[PDB]
């Protein structure tokens, strides 16, 4: 397991390449494998320790990438759960609020979406144009 901490950045990079090329399903598989590596390393660490936390933080963007792939393939249940897990630890994560909001909006949880999009707005005001758009689209279906 430990020898594969070196593999993670390369897997991460290949997943990104696949994603941007439009191979979203294959990208998700790459992200999943990268996260699995980090989780295996994290299991050897005590929860709440510096090393556990560092790995947890290396997992976050990969897990959000994975969630982004799930949004594209219209699978919302895992996005909601993974974003919620991230946000229950790191409640300032803008990307997690945004993706969870997208997923809430896509499953007709209009109120939970608005709440998440408000948090995006609160934490990164530069995203106001996008949030306004998401909000306008929610209101349109009201």
């Amino acid at each position: 397991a430990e020898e594969k901490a070196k593999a993670v950045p390369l897997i991460h990079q290949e997943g990104n390449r696949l994603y941007r090329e439009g191979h979203v399903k294959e990208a998700a598989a790459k992200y999943y494998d990268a996260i699995a590596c980090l989780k295996n390393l994290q299991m050897k660490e005590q929860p709440g320790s510096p090393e556990w936390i560092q790995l947890d933080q290396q997992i976050t963007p990969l897990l959000l990438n994975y969630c982004q792939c799930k949004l594209v393939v219209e699978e919302y249940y895992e996005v909601l759960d993974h974003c919620s897990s991230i946000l229950n630890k790191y409640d300032d994560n803008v990307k997690a609020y945004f993706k969870r909001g997208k997923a809430h909006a896509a499953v007709w949880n209009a109120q939970e979406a608005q709440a998440d999009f408000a948090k995006v707005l609160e934490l990164d005001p530069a995203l106001a144009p996008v949030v306004s758009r998401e909000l306008q689209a929610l209101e349109a279906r009201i």
Binding site: R20, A27, L64, Q68, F98
Partner: peptide
Amino acid sequence: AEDDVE
């Protein structure tokens, strides 16, 4: 972008 990957 918010629909890109990190």
